[PDB]
Amino acid sequence: KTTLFCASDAKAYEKEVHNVWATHACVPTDPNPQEMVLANVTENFNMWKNDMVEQMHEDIISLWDESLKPCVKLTGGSAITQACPKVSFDPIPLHYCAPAGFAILKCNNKTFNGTGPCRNVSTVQCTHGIKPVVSTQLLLNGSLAEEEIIIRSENLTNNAKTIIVHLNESVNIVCTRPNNIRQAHCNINESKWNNTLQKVGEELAKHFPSKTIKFEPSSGGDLEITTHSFNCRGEFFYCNTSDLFNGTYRNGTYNHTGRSSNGTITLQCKIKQIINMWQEVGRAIYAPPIEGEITCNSNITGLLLLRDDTETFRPGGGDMRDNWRSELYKYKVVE
Ligand SMILES: CNCc1ccc2c(c1)[C@@H](CC[C@@H](O)CO)[C@H](CNC(=N)N)[C@H]2NC(=O)C(=O)Nc1ccc(Cl)c(F)c1
Numbered sequence: 001k002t003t004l005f006c007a008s009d010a011k012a013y014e015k016e017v018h019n020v021w022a023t024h025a026c027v028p029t030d031p032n033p034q035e036m037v038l039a040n041v042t043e044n045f046n047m048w049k050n051d052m053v054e055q056m057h058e059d060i061i062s063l064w065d066e067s068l069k070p071c072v073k074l075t076g077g078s079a080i081t082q083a084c085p086k087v088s089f090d091p092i093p094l095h096y097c098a099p100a101g102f103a104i105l106k107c108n109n110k111t112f113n114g115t116g117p118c119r120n121v122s123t124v125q126c127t128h129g130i131k132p133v134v135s136t137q138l139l140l141n142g143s144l145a146e147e148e149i150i151i152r153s154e155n156l157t158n159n160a161k162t163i164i165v166h167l168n169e170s171v172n173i174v175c176t177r178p179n180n181i182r183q184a185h186c187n188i189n190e191s192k193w194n195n196t197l198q199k200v201g202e203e204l205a206k207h208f209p210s211k212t213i214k215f216e217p218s219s220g221g222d223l224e225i226t227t228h229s230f231n232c233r234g235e236f237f238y239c240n241t242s243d244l245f246n247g248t249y250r251n252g253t254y255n256h257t258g259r260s261s262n263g264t265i266t267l268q269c270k271i272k273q274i275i276n277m278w279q280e281v282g283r284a285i286y287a288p289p290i291e292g293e294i295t296c297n298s299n300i301t302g303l304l305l306l307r308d309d310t311e312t313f314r315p316g317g318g319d320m321r322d323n324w325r326s327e328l329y330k331y332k333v334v335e
Pocket residue numbers: 134135136162222224225229230231236275276277278279280281282317318319320321
């Protein structure tokens with residue numbers, strides 16, 4: 001166990017909050033990265049018990065605390081009011097590095113699921129650029145699996161454990177509040193989502209070989225986890241995914257039961273001033289949305305799912321440690 005330090009390409013001049021935080025908290029990214037390959041060596045990794053996830057989690061909590069100041073912060077009767085200026089918000093990649101006497105082991109097995117022995121290992125000083133995208137159900141702006149789609153879980157037999165689906169080809173999602181001022185929508189090409197869930201059901205089919213795979217909307221709970229939610233240009237977008245997570249995979253083929261028009265799936269979205277905080281139990285109140293068109297163009301690189309004759313998968317998420325595990329699975333800090 002050691003104390004990592006972050007490395008970024010953040011610009012001092014930029015007023016975007018990730019750049020400001022990284023200018024005084026991270027170091028400039030080394031432009032001459034060194035990677036040593038150890039094909040003979042095999043090491044044991046566990047993406048679900050990784051201290052780098054906890055360190056990145058506290059770093060992004062500090063980033064959000066310094067950057068996205070709410071107008072009112074309510075923690076069980078105690079309300080803290082501050083200045084809540086509208087800021088420029090666009091996540092930047094963050095590399096995580098180990099100090100001297102320590103290194104970062106990197107698993108190059110393109111089929112690795114995060115747990116067990118990895119036979120082709122490498123040694124690096126930092127990880128790749130990881131955008132700290134805080135979202136539920138859909139993992140946005142991440143890295144894609146080089147080979148086949150990968151299914152990751154701490155314990156697939158436990159329906160309470162979050163399932164991380166790592167896609168090998170991205171799905172473009174465009175969310176926009178166009179120029180009620182809290183009504184927004186996302187556009188997703190139904191053809192790409194058809195084939196994506198087609199072979200996500202195939203890979204899930206190998207894990208549960210009867211058991212026709214069925215995709216359904218979140219059972220219940222807080223609005224942040226019952227809808228695909230993400231922060232776009234400093235604004236909080238909550239998007240209904242009932243149409244998106246609506247399909248049945250049976251006899252090797254996928255059928256989408258979600259409503260679609262003109263080959264595109266549209267998710268109704270609402271921008272909410274009142275937010276249930278991911279960083280800690282409590283609520284944060286923010287100012288009304290900025291005037292003009294608020295649009296985010298993102299790539300869906302992963303899915304967060306929960307498993308309930310037939311196996312049903314519903315979108316989950318919330319524990320933002322899982323959003324970091326989807327990118328930190330191939331690393332392990334060793335002395
Ligand atoms: C199986 N996992 C179950 C599960 C489910 C939901 C939640 C947890 C666990 C807690 C995780 C805590 C932990 O991580 C400690 O650090 C966390 C506690 N907080 C409150 N109940 N309010 C709580 N998460 C949230 O409610 C939350 O993320 N909302 C939110 C807002 C804005 C955006 Cl954009 C967004 F995408 C999400």
